[PDB]
Amino acid sequence: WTATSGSCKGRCFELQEVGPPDCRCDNLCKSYSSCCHDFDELCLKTARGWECTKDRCGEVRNEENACHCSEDCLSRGDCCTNYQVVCKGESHWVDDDCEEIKVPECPAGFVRPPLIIFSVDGFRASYMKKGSKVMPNIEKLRSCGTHAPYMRPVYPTKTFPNLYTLATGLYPESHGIVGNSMYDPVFDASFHLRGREKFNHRWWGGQPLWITATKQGVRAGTFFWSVSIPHERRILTILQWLSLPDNERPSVYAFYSEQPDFSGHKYGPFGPEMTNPLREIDKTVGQLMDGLKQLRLHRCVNVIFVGDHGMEDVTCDRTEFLSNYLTNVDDITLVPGTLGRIRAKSINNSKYDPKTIIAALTCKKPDQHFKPYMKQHLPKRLHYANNRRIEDIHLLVDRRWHVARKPLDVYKKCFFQGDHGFDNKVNSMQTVFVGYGPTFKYRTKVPPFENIELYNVMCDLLGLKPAPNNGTHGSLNHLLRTNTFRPTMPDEVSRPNYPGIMYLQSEFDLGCTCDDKVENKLEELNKRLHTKGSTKERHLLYGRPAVLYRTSYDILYHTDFESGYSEIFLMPLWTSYTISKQAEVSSIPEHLTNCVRPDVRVSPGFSQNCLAYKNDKQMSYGFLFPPYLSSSPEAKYDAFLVTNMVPMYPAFKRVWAYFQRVLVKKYASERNGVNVISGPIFDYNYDGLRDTEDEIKQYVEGSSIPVPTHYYSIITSCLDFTQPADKCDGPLSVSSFILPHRPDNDESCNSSEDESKWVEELMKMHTARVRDIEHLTGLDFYRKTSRSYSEILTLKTYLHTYESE
Ligand SMILES: *[C@@H]1O[C@H](CO)[C@@H](O[C@@H]2O[C@H](CO)[C@@H](O[C@@H]3O[C@H](CO[C@H]4O[C@H](CO)[C@@H](O)[C@H](O[C@H]5O[C@H](CO)[C@@H](O)[C@H](O)[C@@H]5O[C@H]5O[C@H](CO)[C@@H](O)[C@H](O)[C@@H]5O)[C@@H]4O)[C@@H](O)[C@H](O[C@H]4O[C@H](CO)[C@@H](O)[C@H](O)[C@@H]4O[C@H]4O[C@H](CO)[C@@H](O)[C@H](O)[C@@H]4O)[C@@H]3O)[C@H](O)[C@H]2NC(C)=O)[C@H](O)[C@H]1NC(C)=O
Ligand SMILES: CC(=O)N1CCN(c2ccc3[nH]c(=O)n(CC(=O)NCc4ccc(Cl)c(Cl)c4)c(=O)c3c2)CC1
Ligand SMILES: [Ca+2]
Ligand SMILES: [Ca+2]
Ligand SMILES: [Cl-]
Ligand code: NA
Ligand code: NA
Ligand SMILES: [Zn+2]
Structure with missing residues (x-):
């Protein structure tokens, strides 16, 4: 109850808002329908419209008018906006040439x-x-x-x-307003565009x-x-x-x-x-x-x-109906439209299976205009998961389409020709x-x-x-013409170890085998230089990434790639290599098919093991630096070190292998060399931030080897592509991705065809900013370039969207 019998005299559009039951005069009172009884009369004057005319100039001030053309109006601050133009021969702002504003030109007191x-x-x-x-x-x-x-x-x-x-x-996941409508399961309430519930502050973080x-x-x-x-x-x-x-x-x-x-x-x-x-x-x-x-x-x-x-x-006839896909469509609630969110209709019901719902919605019709996702599998670039108001099941709807639950929801609720809400990369x-x-x-x-x-x-x-x-x-x-903020690089928290050769082959009990024992002082000093960082200026072009949390890790140098190897997660946090335009792709020779070699710089106790992979019937493994791009048959042995190995589902190896074998070469070709940094990401709680070791929910069977949720790559070249990536004098050009590490390719409806028909499409979808990868890894990239830091920060926020112009 508001006693709206108070007055707005002298309080029109008051800045500080008054506490009920006293009536209000601020620009929101109408929405709370709690304006004072005279608000319209005093505060929403409309008499004589919005513009001066010749006949109003100098007029005697009438307080009933919407705005004023009287003499005193400038000092009162309530002239009509064209007063000066009509009554003082001034010109409209738009008709003035623009003059650069080198300094603020403010009245006294500002x-x-x-x-x-x-x-x-x-x-x-x-x-x-x-x-x-x-x-x-x-x-x-x-x-x-x-x-x-x-x-x-x-x-x-x-x-x-x-x-x-x-x-x-x-991000909406962090501020709480994850939609135009949304349901909070803790509040057991719904927020909508229309209605009063939105006024409650509990929604707005x-x-x-x-x-x-x-x-x-x-x-x-x-x-x-x-x-x-x-x-x-x-x-x-x-x-x-x-x-x-x-x-x-x-x-x-x-x-x-x-x-x-x-x-x-x-x-x-x-x-x-x-x-x-x-x-x-x-x-x-x-x-x-x-x-x-x-x-x-x-x-x-x-x-x-x-x-x-x-x-x-967007028009009514471009609507996909869930009733065409599910038989049990009355068990769900759908937030409909240009995105879909699905939850159980009767909450706390154990008949409801999200997994069976997703499967009924996956690749069911050849021209299907939506794709279902568990929220945690959505592209990480959308940052759309970490909020209890975001339903576990999400539908990304194609541009120009709608999703609805049943036909009755559209013809009993064509009105519209336009809508929005689609993927934020859509033109x-x-x-x-x-x-x-x-x-x-x-x-x-x-x-x-x-x-x-x-x-x-x-x-x-x-x-x-x-x-x-x-x-x-x-x-x-x-x-900005003048900056009050001077950005600086976050400090490195963990410094690396640089291990040398510390272990004899026979100390390793990893169940690994390799065909590597095939028999010179010239190429012997030369190989040893590589293990100590001789080629590092070539493969680490922007300095080593900085590790921004407390951990234990080693830098490992090699002829073709450098890595940052974590003793805690038993795999690299990052692996860095450069592939010039000239470089050539080779195969893994047959004798080396299942080859994995102990790394004598790294203790047995901090290494992965082949036995674990043998026992895990789901989990296979891959390599961060690709053997396919080794610079020489001799350097190729380095790519098979146990320290370059990472856990990979066979379904995912299809994606990875095609990226490594075909795409890296193509990008090097198109961009005149590329530098690649690749690594694992662990984000089991889908908060977009690096997981600590005690947050990992999946390990390779019978081992302490953690299973990544994603794999990233950052691909850098010279923005001036006439310069090669490894000798670039100016600004850089980047594109990155964060690929979900998934045991099936259900996401890609075409995955039963050759990789050349679906893999690149998938990677495009999962395009990312370097900055996304930084939050997910706790690393800081591009520490040593010739470029200004604010230019690097812009580079790290860049997203390659793959839209046309
Ligand atoms: C984008 O930017 C944002 C902003 O920087 C980043 O989000 C921050 O991430 C921080 C790290 O996760 C997080 O810090 C935590 O805060 C906890 C305190 O939370 C309250 O206080 C803050 C400060 O005012 C407030 O902002 C929060 O507001 C949230 O919650 C309300 C609703 O409850 C919403 O209205 C609001 O929108 C916001 O919701 C969002 O955040 C929460 C998580 O905080 C999500 O759950 C929501 O879904 C939503 O996204 C809160 O009101 C604090 O308790 C945490 O500390 C624990 O963990 C640390 C580990 O170091 C430890 O030191 C502490 O002791 C503590 O551990 C104990 O508590 C645990 C949890 O209760 C318990 O399990 C343990 O056993 C221990 O007892 C932590 O510091 C910060 O709050 C958010 N800020 C915001 C605004 O979201 C975001 O990460 C960035 N995104 C990306 C991709 O980079
Ligand atoms: C958080 C907080 O302080 N409160 C207190 C005030 N509450 C409130 C109250 C009355 C409202 N009346 C109204 O007409 N509308 C429409 C409107 O203004 N739309 C434009 C607009 C501009 C800025 C932003 Cl940021 C947003 Cl999202 C929307 C509102 O949204 C609205 C919201 C929200 C929670
Ligand atoms: Ca809008
Ligand atoms: Ca996380
Ligand atoms: Cl919405
Ligand atoms: Na296996
Ligand atoms: Na598929
Ligand atoms: Zn709209």
């Missing part, structure tokens, strides 16, 4: 440039080009300020997960920019807006707050637009009906900018123009970024980046120290 976030729902990246003729304000911001060709949203590419990622720097600001003494306007407040009133409210006294005035402001998303859903991303909502958004930008120029804040404010996701063509889902102001660069294009990175930059723009988040601080330093 302790720092204000930040205004202008966020636009459903603003697909390609609107910047395709709608350019009808968005002159936005086009000016874009070409004058700093801009990216597109910004990658987070998955799912839905509104609430994305806006709250913008505000926190956190992390620390959003406004709490970060407030905790450090910077004042923040509200980021949420009630839908009923029109856009003209939001702009005028922001401009009013900007006229407040220094000690009361916010330093950060957010404006939110429901468009073009609202129309996009109705008309598709490029419906003829889409031109007007784009005109209208642009007009609002103009209003804000004229509003700023009026207050002489237009060369003082940093403005971020940002979308939460794009929009794709139609990319969105926009423009930064404009004193702190952003002038007429600068930056590469596409992920929206998780902005929280750190916004904190910098406000002089705040950011809460711990998923951005990589420093990786967007190149957006």
